[PDB]
Design a protein around this ligand. Structure first.
Ligand SMILES: [Cl-]
Ligand SMILES: [Cl-]
Ligand SMILES: [Cl-]
Ligand SMILES: [Cl-]
Ligand SMILES: [Cl-]
Ligand SMILES: [K+]
Ligand SMILES: [Mg+2]
Ligand SMILES: [Mg+2]
Ligand SMILES: [Mg+2]
Ligand SMILES: [Mg+2]
Ligand SMILES: [Mg+2]
Ligand SMILES: [Mg+2]
Ligand SMILES: [Mg+2]
Ligand SMILES: [Mg+2]
Ligand SMILES: [Mg+2]
Ligand SMILES: [Mg+2]
Ligand SMILES: [Mg+2]
Ligand SMILES: [Mg+2]
Ligand SMILES: [Mg+2]
Ligand SMILES: [Mg+2]
Ligand SMILES: [Mg+2]
Ligand SMILES: [Mg+2]
Ligand SMILES: [Mg+2]
Ligand SMILES: [Mg+2]
Ligand SMILES: [Mg+2]
Ligand SMILES: [Mg+2]
Ligand SMILES: [Mg+2]
Ligand code: NA
Ligand code: NA
Ligand code: NA
Ligand code: NA
Ligand code: NA
Ligand code: NA
Ligand code: NA
Ligand code: NA
Ligand code: NA
Ligand code: NA
Ligand code: NA
Ligand code: NA
Ligand code: NA
Ligand code: NA
Ligand code: NA
Ligand code: NA
Lengths: 142, 337, 132, 53
RNA sequence: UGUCCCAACGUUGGGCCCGGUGAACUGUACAUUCCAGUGCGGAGUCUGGAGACACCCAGGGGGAAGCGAAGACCCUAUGGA
RNA sequence: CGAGUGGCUUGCUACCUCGAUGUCGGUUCCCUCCAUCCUGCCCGUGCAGAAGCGGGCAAGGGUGAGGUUGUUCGCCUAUUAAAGGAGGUCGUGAGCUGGGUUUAGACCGUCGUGAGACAGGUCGGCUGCUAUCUACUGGGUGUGUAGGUGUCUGACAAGAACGACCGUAUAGUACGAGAGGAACUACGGUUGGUGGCCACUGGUGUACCGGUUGUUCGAGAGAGCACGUGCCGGGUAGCCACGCCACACGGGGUAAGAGCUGAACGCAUCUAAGCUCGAAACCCACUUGGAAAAGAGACACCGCCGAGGUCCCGCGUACAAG
């Protein structure tokens, strides 16, 4: 509830990675970002493998633990984290000043960062975060 | 060559620690099949005795014969729905929306709660129906509590408040069914929900035993042969291998035992009566005398005598309910002897 | 096998010596195995009422001594439970040698036999004196 | 049923049915009665016994 | 015959909390780690990740190649007995 | 004959430790691998049936008990769905054990002039430490989130919470000359595991009651001591197990596989695009944990001079302190 985002990005049909990279880019310049419609974000490749990766990451852990998220909320933010020095006090701030959202809880339509948009007419091999999530066994709340 | 063997104890009731509420809390609920209704009750554990019965099971060759069954007596005096709680659907799970209360409060509901003085039972209702119009109305549950006073054997008076779920035909129907149950005074009883013969799930906080060794806590073996006269009698060989250079959690150690919550599955209801038909001679040891609203449960039940145990229509029943079983003889013979 | 219609608490172990309840020429029998039973690490193999066991002939006629034969538990000292809750214990532990089809190798049976034994082995039962 | 030692009515769903070497049957209502017979006592001499009352 | 199946309950002294008395071992430093990797080829301290709010009580000892003893085993010494 | 993979064995190498990283075997307790012994779904057959034989997916679960031997190994028995193999300093001695290897004593054989030797055999021959750090099991005190009471939510985490067998009917049926002899499905039970409970059976019960030996208080009455009850008989509560209760089905997605539609390639083709199905395995379901989830949550009510809480007092459904 209420996040004075300087920038509202729309992940719909966009390549998650490329997106998380540009967000990290801005969150480091102080920019208060909010990513929207994560469930509709996309990551290219062969589904059956892309999932193994994500599944494996869930199995991974022991006592200390390796908390890997399953919701398309977490998945995205965690991906963004990896593009930031989240442990240095400067990057923590940059991270925390960034938030991912399921759907669009805002009034304005999000914007699509350049070159992040995927062409559905030209690509058939890709996955919706939502699919992966449901696959991982997450509860489809969106 | 190291003969195989399953591990000692289950990693499914962990972490084996003290429970947060001496009152059990259900995680799952029965699906919305028949007419609108509350899906759970409660009462205080009284004790053990046997009831002689007629073999009900149509697939028992012995069908129709005498048969002695163990029964845990439990006092189930009428509980009271004091409000209707409604959750809404958000992309972050289910969250409470509001509550609609009454005015008629039990003379002692203040020993636990900060009983309401000025509530709006219409605007909340209003807001609820509005969420329903929108299509974001998640399930409906009533805040319920007991009358420990109603059970003399139970020393406590301070009511054990707790939320049970209402699920009926449509959502509208049970919203109303809910509203009405409340509006009056919230008073309801076992018969209202359950029926003898049916299968229910009895959740309860087990008898507490303090800190205990691994032998009693995980069912590991005491030392054997010569090993036992060596200075180690009730402790494992090792905490783990060299590497990983650490002690896992999967290894059985000393700790808290008992006073954990368990939702014991598929308990049959023999009979639901009232009066002293069940009570024993001398009196239910460490408990007292029973006389009033009760329920007879087949087998064991979590917790010691006097502990609150909740009921819920079995969510994963294996057998079809063989209603109102014939009760030929309920033993009243003393427990001491 | 078919239900005994009663709850048993095994009174025997592999290695237990018992009484041979028949005119077979066997007096003392030694338990050896338990048909259809696999234990768990360290647990010594338990045998109770109405169990088809495997036995070594301990004492008796020089023809019957040392013979590996099958048999059926017919009496034991540990209390076994009936439907109505009562308990039932015997004087001693015993079994009657049996063959492949499960028909007694001997002619007559000595001493009593629990009624629950009948339901699993009728051929042995229909040859009984007292059926308690 | 009735106890074949003491003679007190036996509570249904309670007891042991001892079977002797000859074949005879003896229902006891308690462990007290069993061990009182295993000593060599006869229900007649024991005063607390209903047989004796 | 509790050696074992297969453990239970009990007794006595400790154990635990309070008053009083009051040592030793051991200590390059830093030290909340875990999974991998890497290095004189067996890392809490390097590299990459993961995880980690601080303090405390009790425990059985997984790791510190834990502490104790300048290896008795092996070879070397223009050593000894 | 040719190409390789693993790092259980053996050997080679001499990088690492000789101011010491405790041996072999065993035990106990914990996680793992798959190159699968059983269990689930498949394929082929020299597949009638039943029973097998060979291969594929598959690591959920299981994989037990004993006789000789220090043995590992292995040989043998009876059971068994099957009684698979391997990694973790050939996992585990600041856990146990110490039977073997390998001190000092001694005997035999062999060798030797001899002291004495042996990759020959045999008898006897010790197991230190008060945990500082870390780690995990359980338990408390503070701080943060920024007044209190009660009820919640669920990021995530844990589960094997269940595995397997026998039997009845289907059936003396299908199939088969005959002998023999299935299945789907429905039931009942056992076993292993798991969680809880004590009406019942059993244990305990140096609470309690009784019998009795010795001795002392003169006798009697009533008592003390006899190791923490003299011994014996009985035994309540409770705690217990050898006692008793409870522990799915079904969906969703797939593998090996069986197929559909279908082109590249007019045809054909299960695959390339697309679609239907299909494993004890995977996701949900179900049980337990869980606002310190830093995005540090939600609701309701009370209260901010007063709601509520602590100490106090009598006690436990709780308990080593807390
Ligand atoms: Cl983890
Ligand atoms: Cl960083
Ligand atoms: Cl594509
Ligand atoms: Cl041991
Ligand atoms: Cl066997
Ligand atoms: K060395
Ligand atoms: Mg009792
Ligand atoms: Mg009784
Ligand atoms: Mg063993
Ligand atoms: Mg690091
Ligand atoms: Mg030196
Ligand atoms: Mg030397
Ligand atoms: Mg010299
Ligand atoms: Mg070297
Ligand atoms: Mg060491
Ligand atoms: Mg394979
Ligand atoms: Mg066949
Ligand atoms: Mg595994
Ligand atoms: Mg080793
Ligand atoms: Mg091992
Ligand atoms: Mg060690
Ligand atoms: Mg040592
Ligand atoms: Mg030795
Ligand atoms: Mg020797
Ligand atoms: Mg020796
Ligand atoms: Mg020590
Ligand atoms: Mg005394
Ligand atoms: Na991509
Ligand atoms: Na994970
Ligand atoms: Na000792
Ligand atoms: Na010791
Ligand atoms: Na003992
Ligand atoms: Na340690
Ligand atoms: Na080697
Ligand atoms: Na060293
Ligand atoms: Na060893
Ligand atoms: Na497997
Ligand atoms: Na052997
Ligand atoms: Na080592
Ligand atoms: Na040692
Ligand atoms: Na050892
Ligand atoms: Na499936
Ligand atoms: Na909080």
């Amino acid at each position: 509830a209420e996040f004075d985002a300087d920038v509202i990005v729309d992940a719909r049909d966009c390549i998650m990675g490329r997106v998380a990279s540009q967000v990290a880019e801005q969150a480091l310049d102080g920019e208060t970002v909010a990513v929207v419609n994560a469930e509709r974000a996309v990551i290219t490749g062969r589904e059956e493998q892309i999932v193994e990766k994500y599944e494996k990451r869930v199995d991974i852990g022991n006592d200390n633990g390796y908390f890997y998220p399953k919701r398309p909320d977490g998945i995205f933010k965690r991906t963004i984290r990896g593009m930031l020095p989240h442990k240095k006090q400067r990057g923590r701030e940059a991270f925390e000043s960034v938030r991912v959202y399921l759907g669009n809880p805002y009034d304005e339509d999000g914007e699509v960062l350049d070159g992040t948009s995927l062409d559905r007419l030209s690509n058939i091999k890709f996955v919706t975060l939502g699919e992966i999530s449901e696959t991982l066994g997450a509860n489809k709340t969106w | 060559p190291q003969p195989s063997r399953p591990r000692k104890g289950s990693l499914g009731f962990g972490p084996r620690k003290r429970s947060t509420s001496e009152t059990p809390r259900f995680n799952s609920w029965p699906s919305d099949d028949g007419q609108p209704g509350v899906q759970g009750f409660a009462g205080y554990k009284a004790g053990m005795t046997h009831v002689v019965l007629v073999n009900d099971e149509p697939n028992s060759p012995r069908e129709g014969m005498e048969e002695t069954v163990p029964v845990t007596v439990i006092e189930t005096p009428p509980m009271r729905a004091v409000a209707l709680r409604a959750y809404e659907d958000t992309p972050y799970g289910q969250r409470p929306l509001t509550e609609v209360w009454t005015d008629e409060f039990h003379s002692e509901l203040d020993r636990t709660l900060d009983v309401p003085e000025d509530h709006d039972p219409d605007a909340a209702e209003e807001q609820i129906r509005d969420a329903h119009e929108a299509g974001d109305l998640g399930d409906l549950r009533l805040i319920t509590h007991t009358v420990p006073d109603a059970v003399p054997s139970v020393p406590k008076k301070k009511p054990d408040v707790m939320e049970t779920r209402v699920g009926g035909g449509s959502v509208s129907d049970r919203l109303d069914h809910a509203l009405d149950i409340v509006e009056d005074g919230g008073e309801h009883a076992m018969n209202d929900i359950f029926r003898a013969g049916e299968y229910a799930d009895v959740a309860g906080v087990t008898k507490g035993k303090g800190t205990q060794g691994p032998v009693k806590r995980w069912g590991v073996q005491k030392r054997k042969g010569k090993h036992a006269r060596q200075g180690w009698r009730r402790r494992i060989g090792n905490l783990g291998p060299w590497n990983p250079s650490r002690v896992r959690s999967t290894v059985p150690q000393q700790g808290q035992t008992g006073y954990h919550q368990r939702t014991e599955l598929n308990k049959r209801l023999i009979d639901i009566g009232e009066g002293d038909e069940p009570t024993v001679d001398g009196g239910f040891v460490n408990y007292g005398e029973v006389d009033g609203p009760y329920t007879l449960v087949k087998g064991s039940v979590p917790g010691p005598d006097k502990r609150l145990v909740r009921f819920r229509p079995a969510v994963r029943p294996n057998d079809q309910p063989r209603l109102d079983p014939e009760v030929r003889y309920v033993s009243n013979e003393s427990n001491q002897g | 096998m078919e239900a005994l219609g009663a709850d048993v608490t095994q009174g025997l172990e592999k290695g237990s010596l018992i009484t041979c309840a028949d005119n077979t020429g066997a007096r003392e029998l030694k338990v050896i195995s338990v048909h259809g039973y696999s234990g768990t690490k360290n647990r010594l193999p338990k045998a109770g009422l109405g169990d088809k066991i495997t036995v070594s002939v301990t004492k008796g006629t020089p023809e019957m001594r040392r013979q590996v034969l099958e048999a059926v538990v017919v009496r034991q000292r540990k209390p076994i439970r009936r439907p109505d809750g009562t308990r039932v214990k015997f004087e001693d532990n015993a079994a009657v040698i049996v063959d492949e089809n499960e028909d007694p190798r001997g002619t007559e049976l000595k001493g009593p036999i629990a009624r629950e034994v009948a339901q699993r082995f009728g051929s042995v039962a229909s040859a009984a004196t007292m059926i308690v | 049923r009735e106890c074949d030692y003491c003679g007190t009515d036996i509570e249904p769903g309670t007891g042991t049915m001892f079977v002797h070497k000859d074949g005879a049957t003896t229902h006891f209502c308690s462990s007290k009665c069993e061990n009182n017979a295993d000593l060599g006592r006869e229900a007649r001499n024991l005063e607390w016994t209903d047989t004796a009352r």
